[PDB]
Symmetry: C3
Subunit: 604 residues, 3 copies
């Protein structure tokens, strides 16, 4: 009775706000405390949850402008009673359809008591039965919450409605959640995903730990799902899930877009980083209009495996990209100490993934996998895959393998050690004949580069398109042409034409070369102009060597050592000075001089 009076004084002090115990909460692990929570929450004061295990017979419903703070994880614990039926998340905002505003949740454990339902049980339908569900809310801060024994998800951010909407690709669901911060939270023992987002935007997930789902379906640590956009994940860890971070959508929904991963650590997940859009992977169906923009950096993947048998024994991956446009990966380290856990492909880019770049990758220990990096395309216009600055330490019988449908690949600065690999084949392999490649270095791979069946073991540099080097300006260069070592005014405008070491010299001659020349022009076919000034070759097989101010216009007509002559004869070699002075006539077997032809000569 005296104690009651002292407590009344303490309560009135409101040192933390109002304690739930002030409204009758026992926190004794037995008594139903729901009414105390509802009373405290409806009072308008910030609510404090002190030490205890606070049992509730139904979900805790949160109105707008709620502050709910506990004494800390495994200190303040909130828990469903054994007798609770189906349908409710443990904690969720009051207005399920159009949402609430300004909800600040901190420092307690949510224990969903899934075990009360027996084993192997997940959510009854849609977004129902997570530990924490936030639906259509603006301005929600979720901090230092531990979510355990969850029926559906640990923490779910979604749009209005108990069900998830399936409106088709290219849509935006009404009533998104917006401005959400999830920090220093933990999710484990969940039936679907640890921390997940749907149909919501402007979300930061920082320093959280999601691990060990109860089930072996599509059970992910962090699941950026249907309708998500404008999300940052940073410095989180996942462990022992299917996907570490999954970014996706189901088929009848828009894929998450514009997602940033600013560092992550994945420990013994199946597919550490798994980006996909279900239903938008086949070549015979349209591209996803939603699956776009993922920038992911400083990614760690450790011992990816499928010991638990997730997803019908799906094969492990450090990284798997499918469906998405515009995925940029920078700074990826994959490490394993057990060669038998992942034996197919370490990193895959396939199934309509397009315009993807990988830079700064180290893959170590995958000595019984078939491929380190494996890429497949669809011969799509404007597509590209860039792979640079990759080092492989006993990872992949094929280090970097490029398959069919890839027309635009850049592969630069790849190195590999294959001495510890079970039956290595090639550091780099391509199906397509025209990859761009440079900077390959290897030891212990029998072949370094296999390009469309041809092996290169002593280094290679391959570039595509019109080529120009050591020339500061030029006119047009054909894609099967080149200009090198020249000054201004040159052009090599047709297939198989080129200019070397020249000035103001142009070729429009299919199968031709101009070298060492000035103000010269080739415009027939099979033309050669060498060491000449003001030379023109304008007929098939016409040529000039060491000639000035001369034009060879004959079929197979070659001019040598001449100035100021124009020749038109077929199969003739000519020379002269201001006029034709000799001829070797291959056609008729005649030799002609303007002056004399003589034997018995000396040169003294």
């Amino acid at each position: 009775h005296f104690a009651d009076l002292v407590i009344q004084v303490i309560d009135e002090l409101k040192q933390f706000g109002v304690s739930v115990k002030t409204y009758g909460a026992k926190g004794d692990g037995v008594t139903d405390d729901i009414r105390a929570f509802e009373k405290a929450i409806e009072s308008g004061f910030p609510v404090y949850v002190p030490y205890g295990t606070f049992m509730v017979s139904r979900g805790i419903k949160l109105p707008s402008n709620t502050v709910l703070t506990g004494a800390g994880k495994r200190n303040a614990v909130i828990r469903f009673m054994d007798s609770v039926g189906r349908g409710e998340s443990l904690m969720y905002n009051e207005n399920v359809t159009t949402g609430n505003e300004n909800i600040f949740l901190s420092s307690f454990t949510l224990d969903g008591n899934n075990k009360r339902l027996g084993q192997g049980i997940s959510g009854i339908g849609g977004s129902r039965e997570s530990n924490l569900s936030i639906r259509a809310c603006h301005n929600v801060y979720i901090r230092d919450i531990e979510a355990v024994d969850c029926t559906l998800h640990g923490i779910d951010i979604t749009c209005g409605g108990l069900d998830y909407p399936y409106l088709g690709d290219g849509t935006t669901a009404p009533n998104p959640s917006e401005n959400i911060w999830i920090e220093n939270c933990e999710a484990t023992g969940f039936g679907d995903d640890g921390i997940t987002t749907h149909h919501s935007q402007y979300i930061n997930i920082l320093n959280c730990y999601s691990h060990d789902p109860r089930l072996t379906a599509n059970c992910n640590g962090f699941e950026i799902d249907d309708g998500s956009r404008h999300v940052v994940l940073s410095n989180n860890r996942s462990k022992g899930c299917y996907g570490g971070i999954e970014i996706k959508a189901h088929g009848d929904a828009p894929a998450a877009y514009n997602i940033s991963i600013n560092g992550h650590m994945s420990v013994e997940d199946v597919r550490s980083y798994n980006f996909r859009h279900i239903g938008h992977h086949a070549a015979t169906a349209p591209q996803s209009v939603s699956a776009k923009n993922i920038v992911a950096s400083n990614l760690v993947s450790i011992r990816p495996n499928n010991k638990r048998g997730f997803q019908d024994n799906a094969t492990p991956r450090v990284l798997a990209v499918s469906a998405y446009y515009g995925v940029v990966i920078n700074g990826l380290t994959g490490y394993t100490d057990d060669p038998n856990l992942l034996t197919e492909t370490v990193v895959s880019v396939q199934f309509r993934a397009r315009n993807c770049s990988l830079n700064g990758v180290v893959l170590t220990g995958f000595s019984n996998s078939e491929n380190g990096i494996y890429v497949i395309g669809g011969s799509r216009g404007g597509d590209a895959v860039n792979i640079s600055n990759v080092t492989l330490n006993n990872s992949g019988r094929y280090g970097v393998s490029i398959g069919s449908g890839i027309e635009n690949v850049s592969i630069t600065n790849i190195s590999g050690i294959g001495d510890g690999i079970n039956s290595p084949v090639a550091l780099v392999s391509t199906i397509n004949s025209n990859p761009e490649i440079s900077g390959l270095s290897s030891i212990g791979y029998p072949t370094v580069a296999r390009v469309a069946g041809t092996d290169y073991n002593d280094g290679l540099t391959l570039f595509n398109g019109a080529f120009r080097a050591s020339t500061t300006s030029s006119g047009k260069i054909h894609s099967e042409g080149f200009i090198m070592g020249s000054t201004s005014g040159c052009e090599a405008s047709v297939s198989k034409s080129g200019v070397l070491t020249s000035s103001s010299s142009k070729t429009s001659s299919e199968r031709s070369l101009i070298a060492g020349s000035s103000t010269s022009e080739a415009k027939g076919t099979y033309n050669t102009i060498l060491g000449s000034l003001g030379a023109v070759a304008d007929e098939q097989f016409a040529a000039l060597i060491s000639a000035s101010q001369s034009r060879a216009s004959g079929n197979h007509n070659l001019i040598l050592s001449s100035y100021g002559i124009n020749t038109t004869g077929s199969y003739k070699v000519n020379g002269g000075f201001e006029k034709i002075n000799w001829e070797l006539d291959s056609l008729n077997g005649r030799i002609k001089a303007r002056d004399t032809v003589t034997g018995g000569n000396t040169w003294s």
Copy 2:
């Protein structure tokens, strides 16, 4: 009276430190609590602020070695009374000029009650009237503070003095703040900037949210301003400001330098990332000596726009760099769903920005903008701009546009889709004739690359300087020269000289080519040496083909199919074996054999 005694016992327990209520604070939203705060703060104990709205009639002044902790944002709230005049920040350190030490502020709302002044009002002068001002302090930790309705800034870190110092570029202001940590803070409804730094160093800003200024001037989410240096920003979000993160200085001050952005999300700002130095942009004034070193990664920009009319309707940008030297951008995603919000340039590098690199960029949705990336230079020595691994999804009529004053550009692995763009022009365009380019891929752009007026639609690779390929060592190669497919000892030392497929062969001959040769040398002009051994061409237009141990020293003198001859005749083709044996004399029209000249021959 009994309650008073119970409270005395509670107070004496000091469970949090000392409560301000112990010193007479009411926290009732009405009573002036300033004396209680001052008494508690001067006591030497850590101070606790429990639930309440604590009104104050003047600024709360903080001495050295202060710990001030509240019950949490929107729980413990500190607020200026309606009657407060002008001149004071709500909370600031005691020693305004030489500063204080060891101040730890946590878990409360600061409400500046700017509305008491009417609307449209900002700070009265210098650093006066922010919610929180830290001046010349060392070791300050600011955590979980919400700053609302601010007259000047939300949170300001500055040097000693109420005014900001304007000492000119290249200076360091006395009495900096140093070792500051700002974490999980929010700033909104401010008159200038949300969270800002001036003239201070060693600062980490982490996981903060700054949004919605009251005014439409230079009102930024995060403003790294005048005199700042050695600052890290990471995992913050800005929304609805002018600049998301601005890094700059005014004209009469040194620019912030050595600044790191380790991830950021910008939502509906005008210029998400805005780096500049006012007064140091013109070509006719000197470069900033202070604007240097920005490394920014994992940057997100969403729907940049100027609907609010900030800064006289400044045009929106995902990124704008001006004035700065040494800006490195890696991993940038810009996304919009409204083509009409930003119609000028998505990313700009101009106005004395120099030595800037962009890698790993995805820009999506900017289908009515003129330029995706736009770069302008000043023909500065040692300057460079590197653009690599960029993909554009309906963003920019010109995808990557390089303007005047750029002598050194590297543009690699750019891809674009232009089918959804309003009147697309070219994926890549340059004014300068000598960009370095490779790895372009596009669909829906009428032109792929336009290089100084010339179009390339079928791929291109352009490199600058002396060129060498498939040759492990060589002597000198001129910048208008090349050596390919050769072994050691070759050189191509003058303009328009080159060596192919040779060994120990050298040319110093302007307009020349040596191919398929050994120990050969060209040293005249217009020289050709092919398939030869020990061949020398040392006069204008001299040449040798299929010759051994021979020297052509005549003007337009060609040697064919020979061994061991030296010729000097003008306009002569010669052949021989240990001595000259025939001549075709183009000059005089003579044909000469040492032995016989005959007709009627057969070859059997």
Copy 3:
């Protein structure tokens, strides 16, 4: 007595858990409170430490499932008494050998009272005498702990046992700690390292500050040491230590592996980022089998110096890599305002470091250092060093210097300003003759590139291996060969062979060139084929120009302007049409026509 009763009511309320004061703690800076701590900790309740300085005469031992929370740093302070002897860390888990589970520590200062021992004193042996030692524990969360005046380390995570195990390289010590989170902690005035890990895995270190060791040995801010693996460090700061972040091992231990640095700021450390494996640096001893996989991004280094004389006056570094395989650095900014602090090398990659990549580097102010970036190798197979997108502002007499033992280097997009440097030499220098280089830009360096003694000041592009440009497919190209500007079916299969501007043309001729041709083949040596169709040159020095369906099989035998002839003569020029029709015989000095040889000709 009444106060005692009120307190009993308060205690029973358990608002924070149980206060240590409930078990008799005074927290008066004098009374020994150890028994109160032990009693509170053994009770099974979460333990709260309120305001006070809580003295203890022996270490606080932590059992499994402990929650220990204070009122905050410099609020709740825990401190060794002056009389405490040697051997114990201030706070550590109970089971030193096989460890404990689920320990959550938050919000207090640990004061090790090292000063009680006099000055210059460090730990008595192994892991003994840190402020906080965690040995063989799973699931430990360490948050907002300030560790001061530490005898050994501030915070140490290690395997079971008081000693550290020295089991040799390539081992894994029993009983690791696992799943550790260290956040918002501070360590200073320590004898060895601030925050350190040994023989443990799955660790995140976030937003911590480690600075100012008492001693000048190997005293690091963050020390990822012997046996560590799978660690992320992000957004920490180090100041005034030897290493900012050190990743290493001692000689008789395995190096830390698979470590990620997701942003860091190093202030006035000696070697900001220092990666090494003691005993595994010499060329005459084996490579580390453990030192692998470091990905480090967004790294800041400020004024590195050795004013304090750490480590026998070790020379300062922004970055030093030795021993490690697979180090990826992206986004590094080094800045100094004092040229005299670091005068040797800014960034070094040496001493068995291999397969390292640096991208996006800005180094500013190091105007009296010998080298900006300095790299040395060991001629190791599969090795590579990639340096790209680097800008230097008055940093390094040699900007990028590559030394001996490097066979595989890629150096791209390097720029430098050297006008402010004391006696600059070259932007780029290499010892090896075959670096791959492009995109160099400089001002104020007397030489731009010095490649094995040869200077290049006007730009250079150098590539290695078989070369191909403007050709979409080909057969084999030798590493001393090339194909350019050609269509399918070509090959240049031997040393010094090449094909230009041709179709279906092949050379296996050492020292050869085919240009402007179709279906042609060179298979002797010193062969030239130009502007020809169906041409074969199959003898030494054989050649064809403007020839169709012809074969030159003679020694030094040239065919000109011909169709359908096969020649075999030595030192002969021939022409013909379906049969040989003329010959110039260099061997014997004969001129032969099938028909007539005549003088007195005109061409009209």
